[PDB]
Amino acid sequence: LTPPVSAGGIQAYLLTGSGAPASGLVLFVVNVSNIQVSSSNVTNVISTVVSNIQINAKTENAQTGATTGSVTVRFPTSGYNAYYDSVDKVVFVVVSFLYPYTTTSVNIPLSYLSKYLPGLLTAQPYDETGAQVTSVSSTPFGSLIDTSTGQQILGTNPVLTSYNSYTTQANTNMQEGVVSGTLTSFTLGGQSFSGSTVPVILYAPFIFSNSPYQAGLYNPMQVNGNLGSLSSEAYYHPVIWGRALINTTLIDTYASGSVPFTFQLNYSVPGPLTINMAQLAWIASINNLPTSFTYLSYKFSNGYESFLGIISNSTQLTAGALTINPSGNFTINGKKFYVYLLVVGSTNSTTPVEYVTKLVVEYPSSTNFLPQGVTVTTSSNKYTLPVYEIGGPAGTTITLTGNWYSTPYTVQITVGSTPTLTNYVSQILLKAVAYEGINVSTTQSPYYSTAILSTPPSEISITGSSTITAQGKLTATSASATVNLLTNATLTYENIPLTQYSFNGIIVTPGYAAINGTTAMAYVIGALYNKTSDYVLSFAGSQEPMQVMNNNLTEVTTLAPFGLTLLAPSVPATETGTSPLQLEFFTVPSTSYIALVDFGLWGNLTSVTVSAYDTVNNKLSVNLGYFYGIVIPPSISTAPYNYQNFICPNNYVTVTIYDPDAVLDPYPSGSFTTSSLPLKYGNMNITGAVIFPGSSVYNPSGVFGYSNFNKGAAVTTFTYTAQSGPFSPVALTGNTNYLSQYADNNPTDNYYFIQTVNGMPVLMGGLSIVASPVSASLPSSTSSPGFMYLLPSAAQVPSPLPGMATPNYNLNIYITYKIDGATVGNNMINGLYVASQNTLIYVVPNGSFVGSNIKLTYTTTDYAVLHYFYSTGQYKVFKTVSVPNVT
């Protein structure tokens, strides 16, 4: 698996975890598969091997992977310990480094060391004098002999005390002691031995492993790919597909047992993103609004509606017989203003039709011209402002009369027959950041090795940059202004008198019909005109990423308010100013990936930065790994088939299907579940998905990353078991309602994992089978997803992680006629069936034997692969196996 090993190389494994006997034991192994070792000369060969092995102790930082100081030592030739496993066929030695056992030998149980070397369970590892010992004796660190001195190391050497007090030492002096191993090249048995250990030692800092790796993050099934014309970037370009998993190995040993780990993914795309975005709301003063226009609300994807916000000094709005009551009100410097939120619809409604749960209005300071934000309160002192409806049948006009200070103003809204909404289409700087989590506990310590999703189903916040500018005409007594935000959005401010304010603003939602009216940006810019020494027109604007749930517009969080100033020492003046503007969208997790496709932040273009987080003991990986999203179209590969592979029930047909993108579990005989939780990362908690290894779906509670977090009993337990009746397939058992929280090696149930809404999977990927002349098909409506235990092909030799995954799918097929028409109790045997874990069986009657065939259609288990290769015709691959016309 990982770390990779070379021919005759040296590697290490730390003994730690839940149930560890003692912290500080490191097992150094050297591969002795190159020569054969018997029990009559094992002492000699191990003596030579430990004579040729050297152990390096290094000083570094607790955040870096850069060698800062190194010293070498060697095992003694007298009083040392050496062992040899003939089943795992490697020579291994245990060394005690950390507290308590640093210079005192300790006994290592066979059963716990068997976790990192299974072979010790079958054949008892050899020791010196040719005796097979049942327990391992650790070589004390203080007994090692210096290579450059020829003497055993002292008891007061700095690295020894550092190991003996590692916790306090690394905590205080921020110096890190890292061990490693090397094998001086030598020839024995006609074969050479030499190598060095990929850092897999007692505890390296919590970063993504980059040595000697040229990328750091990588996926073995990418290495074993059919790169037709992309052969100039094979190992140069760490690409991943759609929602598939990319492997990482986090070195982290600051805790014992299982360690949750948080991941943050940053997606960027080479292209200025042209976004069409709808106006979820318009907020402006009664004078700032036009006297008359045509408007109709835009219906959203969650029941929300577009509404208008009228701000007036009047206590009410009057439209003749209709009166509008305070939706909300606020006060600045003693002056009171009323904000009324009205939905333009098919009728006038007094009752609250929707709500805003948090909206902050900004205004410049009277004395310092600095932004000040206040939450609008209702007439009953509530921070959830109601939003009503006004309007009627198409063509109806309503004239709302309000007061701006002492001046009456009117606005005439015409109810159009079609939504008369203002839509902004602008080029914007955009990128995305998403969060994920996974509990990792593997027998590869210090490597916590796992695979992370390319796009997890979590709260994905798309961030972005644009510009805001303000132009204004300034006089001695009044000043008018306009502001441009989001690169094409315009707001106006009538001539603002002295010491007076004028409010305007917009709430904008993505115009795509999947996140419209679910996430938004709220900008409320107030303006103040004043004269202290020069005529000053100041603008203060808030920035609120915003979300809709239960028809309530609730604020997720608020950004730093921005401020602009226009100063004029002359009576007539024209002034301008500019500032950056921040765009943010916390998309709903269910649509988050879809939103990532909608904004164009995924495909063959995207590049992904990865950061890790020690969720238990609070470390952030200063290292940021990298990979790239790309889509390779699935292909097919077939060969002529012998009739012998159809006759006897031991000869079958193997079909090779190329589709890297359907892999969502690159580990044979493995499975995992997922659950939504508030994940702790950096200094805040964001909704995310924690992945739990195993086959049980739980219902955790509390705040992830604290003592509040505690996973409860298994809500359901998924088990792949043999099913009675016809044949003997291995199929899933459990509550299918949690297939969206379950993932396996099988790609015919992994589309539930991310793209699932209302209990049904949006995506439909993986293998599919049809069979003729007797029409049979799988997945069938009578079989739940996961009706086989199909395992992906193991990774080959050049892959750094052998036996994980391979884009080639080798499917085993039997085509026959003989057992068709048979009876199993009351069941009839005819058509297509699943057997074993990877076997498909097609049975046809006597009349359908001539030309009986199976057609295999493999579809990507990825949304991007379906989208990007629909035109080329290479997103699904089909092939056929048929009974040959034989003489």
Binding site: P270, G271, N604, N623
Partner: protein, 152 residues
């Protein structure tokens, strides 16, 4: 140092050309990367470097100089540089290097994005002089990578 591309005759079966920046004295023991943005600004970031008890921080050690195109009936076409396009054509926060004790930073501009910006064919036909650059504050140099695309 140098800045170049996988090939000078890349066909349109792949729609993303990775920019190779090989800087001798710019790297560190892996990992080490470069944030890019604003003006292709090489925010060289390696918090994984330590030199006797001190961690490393951001070093604003370069920026992509320009992306110019030759169109010469007599005209060396120096492109008027637009900030938004330039930052978004190189938005990658982490360009990791490859070899230890040697800067082999990996960046990249994709063909589909440039074509969508230019409203051209996806992979059918597209060709200009397409000369991107990079300025390194390593020794203060201007490296250039020129490319022309073949239909297929």
């Amino acid at each position: 140092a140098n800045l170049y591309f996988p090939s000078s005759t890349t066909p349109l079966y792949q729609l993303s050309v990775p920019l190779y920046l090989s800087e001798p004295y710019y790297g560190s023991p892996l990992p080490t990367y470069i944030g890019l943005g604003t003006n292709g600004t090489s925010l060289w970031n390696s918090p994984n470097y330590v030199l006797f008890g001190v961690s490393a921080v951001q070093q604003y050690l370069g920026f992509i100089k320009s992306i110019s195109v030759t169109l010469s009936n007599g005209t060396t076409v120096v492109i008027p540089l637009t900030t938004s396009n330039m930052q978004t054509l190189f938005p990658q926060l982490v360009g990791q290097e490859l070899q230890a004790c040697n800067g082999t930073f990996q960046f990249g501009i994709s063909i589909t994005g440039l074509e969508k910006l230019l409203n051209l064919n996806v992979q059918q036909l597209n060709n200009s002089i397409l000369s991107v650059t990079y300025h390194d504050y390593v020794t203060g140099e201007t490296l250039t990578a020129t490319t022309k695309l073949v239909a297929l």
